[PDB]
Design a protein around this ligand. Structure first.
Ligand SMILES: Nc1ncnc2c1ncn2[C@@H]1O[C@H](COP(=O)(O)OP(=O)(O)O)[C@@H](O)[C@H]1O
Lengths: 400, 50, 223, 450
């Protein structure tokens, strides 16, 4: 049956990996839904529950990125997937800046060097990266050097034994380990169409829906470990648990091949067999008990949905506060610290076990801590203004 | 009086970004409210208006 | 009777293949090889259908198709980027007995390039990296063997050095280049050459760093 | 009318047709001029220059032909009209309008003729399959270009190409342009449409060697002057045909465009060769002229001969993206782009082209599925899709739909004012190649698991 559907999910994954790079989470999801509607409309066999973050990559790579300081988010994981299976060297659009450090940590074993287009030595550095093979991450694509057009186009001439790229006037060689990574810190910028054609975009900018989903995930992890654990289980129901079953089967094959007639001499292989049977049974049980778990986790997510909406709204309030005064420059990381302080290390939640009461306490303390941290960095006249915005956000959030 | 040398400010921000301080290190910048302060420096700091 | 006939028809193709396999590697031309193999494929395709049903004809056709697909490995192997060290590495990897003067198309067409492509592209990408590094070394060698100081008369007193900026820029770029090549995964083979060249370059940098100051102070004091 | 009367004297069979031909010529020129103005697009200018070009093209097509029926005359007239008026049009309805109006005026001023033979959908003319400029069926032309494409991957540079109808006609347009003195070409098209690729292919076809500069930062005007001197020397002194190609990237610098404009207009640039450079130029120019078979000594006539050689040997090919606002600045900075260079427009890749590229590139795939069932209603995005389609047709139609979906999404985002990234056929090729790699890897994993 998986063979009967490989065309469809391969089509979706490839179309998502090529396109849907620049768009935000909402547009990516809308495009994927429109695509899937088309193929189901065209009687194309595709699995109804593609987890793109799971189909294109397995557990070990996700763990490696997490150890590479990749934030554990759906959009971040999808971006990292794009950063792995790329036919054209991607362009990173990360105003926050975690993507760059994630690249350097990922390729530090490959001796990745950082360079900027503004640097006059950049071309020289490029030559080195091209001539030796060490990957290079080039920053500040706003001043993109057109001398990168050959490397991006992959036109290489093999004359004699020489695999050359005419980088400007020179004709330097290429080493097979080379790979370029273009980077951007400004989310608002326009590129020439040639650049857009020759690169695949990877957008790391955070939007309203993206931050709302991230905050909802963090709430589900912190307050409801059972719901988050089950949602992660269904994230690993496809691909991962099956891989565990396959490695268990391989271990069984090795163990049974190892015995020289000991299949009955010890009568201990039955213990391993019943272990595999129990693991297969639990996998099958989770496989049949899905729809219940989606409806339950969806109810739980809807429970905290107003909280996530409030978080996104207040964060964008902080971002837009830059118009009131130039001193009001606040980062996403700052709001994340606010969010950790309200969620963990909260004296008010201590000793409280009611989920609804803890949720109400968390909504109150979120606004309280946000105002407490922001007003300290504000002039006295603007404290009333921020209180006004927080009140309006609470009015939008509250029901009744 | 860190606001007197903006270039110095951006280069300190670059140095701070790629560094692992000791668990008790604290850098304090007393500064006059001025637009000459870098945007990135503000973004990476805990702002205190006096 | 039909088996004898089909053997007779395949005799010409087999003799042609044996002729191709006897060509020493130094004399094989992969493009001529591709054209002649395409001609052989067309000639085999011209065979009667009664002979096409036998297993021998299909086997020979599959051999020809495999030869066509490994012809691109032949293209990449004929490249001059392959050195003796890479040949001994390939020797170890394939566990064969090819002798440098004895390499021929037959030895490599007998070895299953349709089974060990991973090994050969590994060794050839390694060869590409090593060659790029050594050609960088050749460029450094030629530029530093050709470079001459620009001497210009000064007040009919001496022939002072000019182009301090250009010489300093060149030595700085070359120093950065060798420093970066140190980090290359193929740096191990050309390690000693890199040591010698970076010693030469550092001595060069110190010499002219002192020389520019000496020249400037001398000129000023002369004034 | 007097020009056309002079022209038709080659074929005594058609002398009474001069007045209807010139009348239809003038009428269609007037309708094109009134319908298309500078308001819609910057390059929608029409002048007696275009119609003199029309007369010249018809004369060139008619010169080697010994005799031709009236339907052939209307066919040549319509072909030249399409190449002069339909070519510069940007958007599909305009192209349909000019096509239909050509039929209308031809039937109006030329009754008692057979419509089907005189004018059909694939009106194509070429001189590759025969000595003269006789019309050729698109299938034989397709086979010829596929063979020459095979040779073209063999020699020069290997670029895989699929051959649909649009590229077929565009190759013809480029070839027609190249075989003309001072035949500068200008191409408007989205990135990755192949503009440089087909230009290089046709240049190889006609023997023109390809020269492109490598623009970068710190590529000062002196570097451009040196490259211009090199190409001028190669084209004029050595009598070596050069297909100069410049993208938009090197056009961005303003200093280059003045020299390019002067070279396009007068076939030469003053001040490029001075001092010792002028001496070397004259030294090599005298040798080149003697090689040609001419004996000139004074500098002025030698420079005139050099200019004539450059006029007859240099073919600048400009390529830029379809940014009409940017086309306005290009017109402002250099009129030669719009007076001398003939403009061609193929920014859009049609649904048929998308289908053909998809089908050709997803051929090594295995989407064959005998048990696949045709749905009663399908979202047909490719109207010419065979029905009932196989699985392969369904997958490639789906891919075409993906491309139109990205186009629609980008249009919608542009409507809302959000920043929009161009969706180029390079994106489509990347999508197809990623599909190939991903499908192969997943089928391999499934097979190994099985
Ligand atoms: N008709 C075509 N068939 C197949 N590939 C094409 C075609 N046209 C363009 N390409 C692809 O486009 C690439 C070159 O594009 P290019 O000509 O540089 O774009 P532009 O026209 O903007 O210069 C090639 O790698 C080629 O694979």
């Amino acid at each position: 049956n998986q063979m009967s559907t490989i065309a469809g999910d391969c089509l979706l994954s490839a179309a998502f990996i090529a396109y849907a790079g620049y768009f935000d989470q909402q547009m990516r999801q809308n495009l994927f839904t429109t695509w899937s509607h088309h193929l189901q409309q065209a009687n194309i066999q595709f699995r109804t529950d593609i987890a793109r973050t799971e189909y294109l990559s397995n557990a070990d790579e996700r763990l490696r990125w997490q150890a590479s300081s990749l934030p554990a988010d759906d959009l971040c994981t999808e971006n990292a997937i794009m950063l792995k299976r790329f036919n054209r060297y991607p362009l990173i659009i990360d105003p926050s800046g975690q993507a760059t450090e994630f690249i350097m940590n990922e390729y530090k074993d490959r001796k990745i060097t950082r360079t900027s287009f503004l640097d006059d030595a950049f071309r020289k550095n490029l030559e080195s990266a091209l001539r030796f093979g060490n990957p290079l991450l080039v920053q500040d694509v706003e001043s993109y050097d057109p001398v990168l057009n050959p490397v991006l186009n992959r036109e290489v001439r093999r004359t004699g034994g020489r695999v050359l790229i005419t980088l400007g006037d020179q004709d330097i060689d290429l080493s097979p380990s080379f790979v370029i990574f273009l980077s951007t810190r400004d989310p608002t910028v326009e590129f020439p169409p040639d650049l857009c054609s020759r690169v695949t975009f990877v957008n790391f900018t955070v939007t309203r829906s993206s931050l709302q989903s991230q905050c909802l995930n963090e709430v589900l992890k912190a307050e409801r470990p059972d719901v988050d654990e089950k949602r992660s289980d269904l994230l690993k129901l496809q691909g991962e648990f099956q891989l565990r079953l396959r490695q268990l089967e391989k271990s069984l094959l090795q163990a049974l091949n190892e015995v020289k007639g000991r299949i009955l001499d010890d009568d201990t292989i039955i213990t391993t067999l019943e272990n595999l049977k129990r693991e297969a049974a639990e996998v099958t049980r989770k496989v049949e008990e899905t729809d219940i778990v989606m409806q339950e986790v969806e109810t739980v997510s809807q429970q905290y949905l107003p909280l996530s909406t409030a978080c996104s709204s207040i964060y964008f309030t902080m971002e837009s506060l830059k118009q009131i005064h130039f001193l009001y420059q606040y980062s996403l990381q700052f709001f994340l610290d606010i969010y950790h302080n309200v969620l963990y290390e909260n004296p008010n939640l201590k000793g409280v076990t009611d989920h609804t009461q803890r949720l109400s306490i968390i909504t109150k303390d979120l606004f309280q801590v946000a105002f407490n941290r922001v007003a300290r960095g504000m002039l006295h006249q603007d404290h009333i203004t921020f209180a006004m915005l927080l009140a309006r956000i609470k009015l939008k959030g509250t029901v009744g | 009086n860190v606001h007197l040398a903006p270039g110095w400010l951006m280069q300190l921000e670059k140095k701070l970004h790629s560094l692992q301080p000791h668990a008790c290190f604290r850098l304090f910048l007393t500064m006059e409210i001025n637009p000459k302060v870098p945007v990135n420096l503000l973004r990476a700091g805990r702002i205190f208006v006096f | 009777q039909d088996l004898k006939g089909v053997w007779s028809e395949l005799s010409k193709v087999w003799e042609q293949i044996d002729q191709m396999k006897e060509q020493p590697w130094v004399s094989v031309q992969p493009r001529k090889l591709r054209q002649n193999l395409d001609a052989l494929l067309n000639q085999l395709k011209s065979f009667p259908a009664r002979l096409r049903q036998y297993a021998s004809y299909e086997f020979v056709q599959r051999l020809l198709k495999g030869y066509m697909k490994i012809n691109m490995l032949v293209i990449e192997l004929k490249s001059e980027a392959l050195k003796d060290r890479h040949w001994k590495q390939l020797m170890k990897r394939l566990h064969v007995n090819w002798v440098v003067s004895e390499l021929t198309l037959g030895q490599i067409w007998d070895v299953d390039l349709q089974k060990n492509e991973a090994i050969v592209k590994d060794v050839l990408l390694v060869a590409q990296g090593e060659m790029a590094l050594e050609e960088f070394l050749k460029q450094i060698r030629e530029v530093w063997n050709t470079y001459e100081l620009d001497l210009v008369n000064y007040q009919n007193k001496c022939r002072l050095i000019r182009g301090w900026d250009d010489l300093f820029n060149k030595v700085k770029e070359h120093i950065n280049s060798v420093s970066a090549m140190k980090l290359s995964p193929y740096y191990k083979v050309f390690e000693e050459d890199a040591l010698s060249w970076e010693d030469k370059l550092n001595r060069i940098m110190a010499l002219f760093d002192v020389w520019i100051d000496v020249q400037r102070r001398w000129v000023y004091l002369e004034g | 009318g007097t020009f056309n009367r002079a022209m038709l004297r080659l074929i005594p069979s058609l002398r009474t047709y001069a007045e209807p031909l010139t009348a239809a010529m003038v009428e269609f020129y007037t309708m094109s001029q009134e319908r298309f103005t500078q308001d819609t697009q910057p390059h929608y200018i029409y002048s007696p220059r275009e119609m003199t070009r029309w007369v010249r093209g018809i004369f060139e097509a008619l010169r080697p032909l010994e005799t031709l029926p009236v339907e052939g005359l209307i066919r040549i007239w319509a072909h030249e009209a399409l190449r002069l008026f339909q070519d510069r049009l940007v958007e599909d309805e305009e192209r349909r309008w000019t096509d239909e109006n050509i039929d209308t005026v031809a039937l109006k001023h030329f009754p008692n003729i057979d419509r089907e033979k005189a004018m059909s959908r694939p009106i194509l003319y070429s001189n590759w399959l025969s000595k003269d400029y006789i019309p050729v069926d698109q299938e034989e032309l397709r086979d010829y270009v596929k063979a020459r494409l095979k040779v073209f991957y063999e020699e020069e540079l290997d670029v895989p190409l699929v051959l649909f109808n649009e590229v077929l006609d565009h190759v013809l347009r480029i070839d027609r342009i190249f075989r003309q003195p001072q035949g500068h070409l200008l191409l408007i098209g989205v990135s990755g449409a192949g503009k440089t690729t087909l230009s290089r292919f046709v240049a190889w076809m006609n023997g023109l060697s390809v020269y492109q500069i490598k623009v970068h930062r710190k590529y000062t005007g002196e570097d451009f002057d040196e490259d211009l001197r090199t190409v001028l020397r190669r084209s004029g002194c050595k009598n070596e045909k050069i297909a100069f190609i410049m993208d938009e990237s090197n056009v961005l610098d303003s200093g280059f465009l003045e020299r390019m404009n002067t070279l396009l207009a007068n076939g030469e640039v003053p001040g490029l060769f001075e001092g010792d450079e002028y001496a070397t130029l004259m030294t090599q120019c005298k040798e080149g002229a003697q090689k040609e078979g001419l004996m000139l000594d004074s500098h002025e006539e030698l420079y005139k001969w050099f200019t004539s050689q450059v006029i007859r040997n240099l073919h600048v090919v400009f390529t830029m993206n379809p940014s009409s606002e940017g086309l306005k600045d290009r017109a402002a900075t250099s009129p030669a782009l719009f007076n001398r260079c003939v403009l061609n427009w193929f920014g859009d890749w049609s649904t048929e082209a998308l289908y053909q590229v998809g089908k050709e590139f997803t051929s090594k795939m295995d989407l064959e599925k005998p048990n696949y069932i045709v749905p009663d209603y399908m979202p047909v995005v490719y109207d010419k899709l065979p029905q009932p389609p196989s699985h392969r047709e369904a997958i490639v139609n789906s891919c075409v739909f993906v491309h139109q979906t990205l186009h629609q999404a980008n249009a919608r985002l542009a409507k809302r004012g959000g920043r929009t990234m161009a969706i180029t056929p390079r994106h489509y090729l990347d999508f197809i190649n990623h599909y190939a790699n991903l499908f192969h890897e997943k089928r391999s994993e499934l097979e190994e698991q099985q």
